[PDB]
Design a protein around this ligand. Structure first.
Ligand code: CLA
Ligand code: CLA
Ligand code: CLA
Ligand code: CLA
Ligand code: CLA
Ligand code: CLA
Ligand SMILES: CCCCCCCCCCCCCCCC(=O)OC[C@H](COP(=O)(O)OC[C@@H](O)CO)OC(=O)CCCCCCCCCCCCCCC
Ligand SMILES: CC(=O)O[C@H]1CC(C)(C)C(=C=C/C(C)=C/C=C/C(C)=C/C=C/C=C(C)/C=C/C=C(C)/C=C/[C@@]23O[C@]2(C)C[C@@H](O)CC3(C)C)[C@](C)(O)C1
Ligand code: KC2
Ligand SMILES: CC1=C(C#C/C(C)=C/C=C/C(C)=C/C=C/C=C(C)/C=C/C=C(C)/C=C/[C@@]23O[C@]2(C)C[C@@H](O)CC3(C)C)C(C)(C)C[C@H](O)C1
Ligand SMILES: CC1=C(/C=C/C(C)=C/C=C/C(C)=C/C=C/C=C(C)/C=C/C=C(C)/C=C/C2=C(C)CCCC2(C)C)C(C)(C)CCC1
Ligand code: SF4
Ligand code: SF4
Lengths: 185, 119, 104, 119, 79, 86, 216, 79
């Protein structure tokens, strides 16, 4: 089926939340939307570190962007998103409520296994993006800076797990060490 | 210098511990598929389907016949009958068609018996 | 069913151990047994503290001997209603007391 | 012998009236609890103050690796001795392996806690 | 370095090391993007190699097939 | 499974049949030779590939040939004992 | 005419008078991991000591004896030893997992070494061993890599082809196709098309003759 | 004189190469496993054959095997 890959032979629903078809459809729609927003949000986290659009250089990047950007600007962004959510409806005859006739030319007249593979790839990427965006936001909130800049400054292990690897080669930050090497891991 | 070791700290493990382990597990999972190595393990549904597709194609529908190539089998047969008539020993009851059928037929029931698995 | 019976036995036991733990938390402040808990290391009940600190304080040997005794014990209807109700109350009390001690 | 028969029948893998989660939980508890120790005592960081925690991490990693191997085994061979009637094949085995992973984590953590608390 | 070579010790050969790494994070990221494109294309190529040719395509696939005029000329010329 | 073939050079001495370890071969009536019999290989599925028939064949070059086929190995041709593929 | 014995499954036949007196060993079949069996049943005039193919020795009962093994090889070796002892009434059966009994060794009731009527040669080739066709000659055909399975007619045809293709000076070179004259399959008689092809071939031959005779 | 008839090619002999058709049992043996059987009086047996509802291992590789022949290539007469 759609959303089930090789690592899981059967559908994963330990709590049996999708007991009925209506609830399964609602959860599928919600999951698709959440995964899409999470995917764009994760690229959204990575790309401002690489570069900033003209005029957006001053603004802070991560959760700090909520305070940095003007409340008026946030209102404008939310208004754009709301206009999109209110003025766009699923295309008649579409696969469901999750589709909006955006890029459907690529999926029209294709083999059903390929359509299922595309839908499942969308869902899996959305799920990984949800997990990754929660990780990014939680780390940003806890450590005061976006995760990418934080890793550049401190590395993969920083100030929370560096204690585990304080005695490793190229990662040795133990007291009295002949080298710090804490920012390279 | 060496500040790029932060890339190594993520790549060397991810490339030499995580990726190889995932590949090994995936290979073990793949080994138990119906068509594990269909191009080298005899008697696979995928291989049988590919052969049937080749047979379906018009050009290759009878390319596996060792005797393929005779434009006019009827004329070839007529010439062979004329030759056998001229070379026939006295009181010979062996006919060209019967001899050709006998030579074409043989008794080798154990050749590629694994075809049954596929079909 | 088997799950209900196992859960009933587990609840009864957790209630008994919870009454026991609540009593062991309450009593030491009121009074403590004398007699050199660990004479080898010159340790006495008045010196040992009450609470999670005891785990670090009193010797691992003593804790292991207590554990061995409990292992031996384990390996070798209005009254019952009162038992189970008091088990519930004692479980709540002991979890609250341990959480408070750990937090503060 | 009678003793060996009884012992093997009373192992967690075989014990009567045990759910697959119970079997896996007990086996994993034992496995993790004894697995943390070797890394704690003989690891590269055995003399460092974080020896116990690093050994706990290594033991949890070992539990995870063996549980992944067991999941591969149940996905490929699919033993059906623990399965309930009218249930997907190997469901009981996969449940037992998942609970073995859980029990290994728990036992490793408990051993590490005991080491830390009692020196 | 602690050299172990007789010639190295004799002639004082050295392994000079720069003060700063040659490439920056952005450059490494660009190279990794190109490598990712290579990886995606390579996975597609591996799938194509694994599945081989599909002679059934003339039954269902769109279009009627095509041979380039140069390919036709090569066929007419022969081997 | 392996391929056990017999050629008309056969003289019907039965040595291959007698040397067969899993009884793959049997003598059958024939008129090609003076002995009026030729070895056959009906049970080629049981052939293990020991080439004892080939060892026992007298003819200048063997009238019986065992062609090994490692790709088509079966449990009978592998002599599996501890494991069963049936 | 041959009657197949009942031969109950070994798991069902725990103790039987037929089983000979044998020592036992770890060389017997693994009952936990295998289900296919082979039963050998014979009749002995006297109790002769014999060696089990699976480990130790045994003593065969005077009368009917039955033994179980894992492989036809073990059964056949025991049968050969019994034949050496002059016990010619032994029979071998293959027992499936479900109890089906297949009479195997004296397939038609006559030992294979003895000629029997009603036997037809199988896997027999009507030529010397070197009469097989060349492996490279039958490539991308039925016998792609098995020249020892080609039919005699195919062998003869391939031999004649290799003889024919030695005479290079007079070999008809296949005309190069005109790719322009290609039409859809949807867009006559088979004989008529053959005749038209033959007219085209004769025209090609005439053109070739003229072209070669131009300068010679 | 062989009762077996080749399913794939009637002209050729059966791949089995046997001359007597198989004998079916009165009741086919059902799937079983060797386990312990506690005697209810403190006793216990080691190798007790007990029924098993389905395949012991539900892998496709295990279940595809029917035992008719080397490749399950024998005709219906094999059963
Ligand atoms: C004024 C702006 C606006 C409006 C009108 C909506 C409207 C909606 N959003 Mg929301 N949404 C907004 C802004 C807005 N969103 C923003 C700024 C984000 C961040 C990207 C999201 C992210 C978001 C997600 C991730 C989801 C919704 C969902 C929904 C629907 C849930 C039903 C409901 O009203 O509650 C609804 C159509 C849910 C939905 O569609 O459920 C079916 C859902 O899953 N929204
Ligand atoms: C990997 C994630 C992913 C995937 C697989 C899909 C898949 C799909 N989306 Mg999309 N979608 C995504 C992310 C994804 N989406 C995100 C993040 C958003 C939020 C912006 C959306 C928002 C969205 C909407 C609103 C709608 C869809 C719909 C669709 C369908 C469009 C048809 C198609 O061909 O899409 C798949 C196509 C692609 C993923 C593009 C592939 C090209 C990539 C980006 C570049 C390749 C580069 C590479 C290096 C070059 C290759 C070289 C060589 C091998 C040739 C399809 C099911 C429609 C739908 O529901 O239809 C049923 C629809 O209405 N999507
Ligand atoms: C796939 C998504 C993802 C990825 C790639 C990362 C990546 C990272 N996270 Mg994590 N994180 C994620 C999701 C993710 N996170 C989510 C969803 C959350 C929200 C709960 C967090 C919350 C979070 C925090 C709060 C912190 C991290 C930290 C880190 C960094 C160090 C990780 C490490 O080596 O720890 C190694 C740790 C150990 C060896 C000790 C074990 C510690 C606990 C007990 C582990 C629990 C999780 C476990 C490993 C998961 C097992 C599998 C799971 C299915 C149960 C690293 C950049 C740390 C950091 O350095 O941030 C700068 C950090 O402090 N993350
Ligand atoms: C085939 C060429 C090649 C080879 C042999 C190596 C070898 C190495 N690289 Mg890599 N590397 C390559 C190309 C190559 N690199 C390229 C093109 C880039 C630019 C993106 C990098 C960028 C890079 C970085 C940033 C780092 C390394 C590092 C390393 C070391 C560990 C592996 C690793 O972390 O890879 C990570 C690199 C990649 C995943 C990028 C793709 C690498 C190539 C193209 C893969 C080719 C696969 C091969 C053809 C077939 C594999 C088959 C497989 C199934 C068995 C090792 C010395 C680490 C190091 O220096 O440690 C001290 C390190 O930190 N490499
Ligand atoms: C080699 C490293 C390694 C590996 C292979 C695994 C493997 C696993 N861990 Mg992880 N884990 C690791 C290190 C590792 N762990 C470390 C160092 C820690 C910190 C102590 C943890 C802490 C941890 C927790 C807390 C949990 C896992 C769980 C899992 C499972 C994740 C996938 C899943 O949901 O399966 C399904 C099974 C799997 C058995 C989860 C698990 O056991 O799920 C049942 C889980 O809850 N792991
Ligand atoms: C009842 C079981 C138990 C007990 C008593 C402890 C006790 C301890 N653990 Mg924990 N731990 C457990 C289960 C347990 N653990 C399990 C199941 C795991 C595996 C995921 C871990 C993994 C773990 C790690 C990786 C670490 C601890 C640490 C600690 C210490 C502080 C915990 C704390 O207060 O966190 C309060 C917050 C919640 C303490 C010795 C830390 C420590 O100090 O190690 C030396 C530490 O680094 N534990
Ligand atoms: C912390 C890190 C943890 C990383 C673990 C990633 C694996 C996630 C799988 C979750 C399955 C979640 C789960 O419970 O699924 C269980 C699922 C059940 O499938 P079955 O069809 O066998 O189940 C039968 C049914 O009745 C029950 O569903 O099987 C698998 O997932 C098979 C796993 C094999 C996967 C093969 C690849 C091996 C990967 C090795 C990676 C190790 C890297 C470590 C570096 C040294
Ligand atoms: C019939 C039946 O079944 O019931 C129905 C009912 C109903 C209602 C329909 C259902 C539902 C939906 C539910 C229950 C949906 C729940 C959704 C939740 C709990 C979402 C949490 C998001 C948290 C986020 C983003 C945290 C973000 C946290 C961040 C960004 C934290 C950020 C920092 O804290 C960090 C991490 C460190 C701090 O120092 C700094 C700051 C910045 C504050 C059901 C149950 O499904 C079905
Ligand atoms: C309630 C369970 C329990 C039982 C059933 C039990 C039975 C016996 C027996 C019977 C066969 C003997 C012979 C014996 C002997 C000693 N016990 Mg022991 N004991 C129990 C509990 C504790 C605790 C809590 C402590 C303790 C100790 C000692 C010391 C050392 C004293 C010292 O420190 O000088 C000695 C010699 C203390 C200790 O190990 O201190 C390091 C300590 O604190 N025991 N104990
Ligand atoms: C969807 C839609 C519509 C729409 C829309 C609109 C307005 C969409 C706008 C989209 C927009 C504005 C999308 C920007 C993307 C920017 C990207 C991807 C930049 C990447 C840049 C990259 C990857 C660069 C990377 C690096 O090189 C850098 C910079 C530094 C180097 O060291 C190396 C690296 C690799 C790190 C219509 C037309 C209104 C109606 C229609 O019906 C439906
Ligand atoms: C033969 C021999 C021997 C052996 C021994 C052994 C082998 C042992 C083992 C041991 C072991 C191996 C042990 C273990 C133990 C374990 C434990 C004790 C565990 C516990 C756990 C727990 C308690 C957990 C919990 C949990 C979980 C599960 C989850 C969640 C969380 C928690 C924490 C709650 C000896 C040496 C004697 C000598 C003589 C002979
Ligand atoms: S195969 Fe050899 S041994 Fe057997 S009959 Fe023919 S010539 Fe004699
Ligand atoms: S190779 Fe061995 S088993 Fe096979 S036919 Fe020859 S003698 Fe018999």
């Amino acid at each position: 089926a759609v959303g089930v890959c090789l690592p899981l032979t059967d559908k994963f629903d330990p709590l049996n939340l999708a007991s009925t078809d209506e609830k399964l459809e609602r959860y599928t729609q919600v999951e698709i939307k959440h995964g899409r927003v999470a995917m764009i949000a994760v690229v959204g986290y990575i790309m401002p570190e690489i570069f900033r659009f003209p005029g957006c250089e001053s603004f802070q990047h991560g959760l700090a962007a909520l305070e940095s950007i003007p409340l008026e600007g946030w209102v404008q962004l939310a208004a754009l998103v709301g206009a999109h959510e209110v003025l766009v409806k699923p295309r008649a005859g579409g696969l469901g409520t999750s589709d909006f006739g955006l890029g459907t030319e690529l999926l029209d007249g294709i083999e059903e296994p390929e359509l299922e593979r595309k839908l499942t790839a969308e869902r899996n990427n959305g799920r990984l993006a949800m997990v990754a965006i929660m990780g990014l936001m939680v780390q940003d909130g806890m450590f005061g800076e976006p995760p990418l800049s934080y890793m550049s400054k401190n590395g993969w292990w920083g100030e929370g797990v560096q204690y585990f690897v304080q005695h490793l080669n190229n990662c040795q930050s133990f007291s009295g060490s002949f080298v710090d090497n804490a920012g390279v891991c | 210098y060496g500040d790029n070791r932060k890339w190594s700290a993520v790549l060397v493990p991810l490339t030499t511990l995580v990726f190889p382990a995932v590949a090994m597990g995936s290979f073990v999972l793949y080994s138990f598929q119906e068509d594990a190595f269909w191009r080298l393990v005899p008697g696979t549904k995928r291989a049988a389907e590919a052969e049937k597709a080749w047979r379906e194609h018009p050009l290759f529908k009878d390319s596996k016949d060792p005797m393929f190539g005779l434009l006019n089998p009827d004329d070839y047969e007529k010439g062979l009958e004329e030759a056998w008539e001229r070379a026939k020993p006295a009181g010979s009851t062996v006919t060209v068609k019967d001899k050709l059928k006998q030579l074409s037929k043989q008794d080798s029931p154990h050749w590629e018996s694994w075809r049954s698995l596929s079909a | 069913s088997e799950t209900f019976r196992r859960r009933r036995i587990s609840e009864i036991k957790n209630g008994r151990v919870a009454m026991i733990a609540c009593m062991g938390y309450i009593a030491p402040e009121y009074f403590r047994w004398p007699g050199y808990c660990s004479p080898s290391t010159d340790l006495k009940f008045a010196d040992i503290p009450n609470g999670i600190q005891a785990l670090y304080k009193m010797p691992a040997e003593a804790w292991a001997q207590i554990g061995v005794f409990i292992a031996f014990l384990e390996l070798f209807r209005r009254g019952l209603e009162a038992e189970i109700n008091n088990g519930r109350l004692a479980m709540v009390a002991i979890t609250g007391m341990i959480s408070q001690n750990a937090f503060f | 012998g009678r003793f060996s028969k009884q012992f093997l029948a009373n192992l967690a893998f075989y014990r009567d009236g045990l759910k697959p989660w119970q079997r896996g939980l007990e086996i994993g508890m034992a496995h993790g609890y004894f697995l943390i120790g070797p890394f704690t005592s003989l690891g590269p960081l055995r003399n460092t103050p974080e020896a116990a925690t690093v050994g706990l991490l290594c033991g949890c990693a070992i539990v995870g690796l063996v549980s992944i191997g067991g999941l591969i085994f149940g996905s490929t061979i699919k033993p059906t001795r623990f399965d309930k009637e009218g249930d997907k094949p190997a469901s009981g085995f996969i449940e037992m392996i998942n609970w073995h992973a859980i029990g290994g984590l728990g036992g490793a953590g408990f051993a590490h806690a005991l080491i830390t608390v009692f020196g | 370095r602690v050299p172990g070579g007789k010639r190295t010790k004799e002639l004082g050969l050295v392994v000079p090391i720069p003060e700063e790494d040659g490439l920056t994070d952005g450059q490494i990221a660009a190279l990794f993007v190109v490598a990712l494109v290579v990886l995606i294309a390579a996975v597609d190529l591996a799938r194509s190699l694994y599945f081989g040719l599909q002679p059934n395509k003339f039954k269902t696939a769109k279009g009627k097939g095509s041979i380039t005029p140069f390919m036709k000329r090569l066929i007419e010329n022969g081997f | 499974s392996h391929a056990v073939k017999i050629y008309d050079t056969c003289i019907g001495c039965t040595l291959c049949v007698r040397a067969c370890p899993t009884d793959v071969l049997e003598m059958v009536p024939a008129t090609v030779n003076a002995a009026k019999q030729v070895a056959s290989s009906p049970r080629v599925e049981d052939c293990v590939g020991c080439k004892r028939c080939e060892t026992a064949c007298p003819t200048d070059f063997l009238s019986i040939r065992v062609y090994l086929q490692e790709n088509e190995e079966t449990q009978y041709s592998l002599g599996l004992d501890l494991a069963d593929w049936s | 005419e041959i009657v197949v014995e009942s031969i109950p499954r070994p798991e069902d036949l725990l103790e039987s008078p037929k089983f000979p007196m044998f020592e036992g060993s770890t060389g017997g079949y693994m009952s936990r991991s295998t289900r296919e069996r082979h039963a050998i049943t014979w009749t002995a005039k006297d109790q002769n000591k014999f060696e089990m193919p699976t480990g130790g020795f045994a003593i065969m009962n005077k009368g009917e004896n039955l033994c179980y093994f894992r492989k036809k090889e073990q059964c056949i070796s025991l049968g050969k030893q019994l034949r050496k002892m002059k016990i010619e009434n032994y029979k071998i059966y293959r027992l499936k997992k479900d109890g089906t009994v297949i009479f195997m060794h004296p397939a038609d009731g006559v030992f294979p070494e003895k000629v029997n009527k009603g036997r037809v040669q199988v896997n027999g080739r009507p030529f010397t061993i070197r009469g097989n066709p060349q492996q490279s000659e039958l490539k991308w055909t039925k016998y792609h890599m098995k020249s020892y399975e080609a039919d005699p007619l195919t062998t003869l045809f391939i031999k004649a082809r290799v003889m024919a293709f030695q005479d290079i000076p007079n070999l008809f070179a296949l005309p190069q196709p005109n790719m322009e004259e290609m039409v859809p399959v949807e867009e006559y008689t088979k004989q008529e098309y053959t005749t038209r092809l033959m007219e085209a071939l004769k025209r090609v031959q005439d053109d070739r003759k003229a072209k070669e005779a131009k300068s010679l | 004189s062989s009762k077996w008839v080749n399913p794939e090619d009637p002209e050729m002999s059966h791949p089995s190469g046997l001359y007597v058709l198989p004998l079916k049992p009165a009741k086919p043996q059902e799937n079983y496993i060797y386990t312990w059987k506690k005697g209810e009086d403190g006793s216990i047996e080691d190798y007790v054959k007990t029924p098993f509802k389905g395949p012991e291992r539900a892998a496709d590789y295990y279940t595809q095997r029917k035992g008719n022949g080397a490749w399950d290539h024998w005709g219906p007469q094999g059963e």
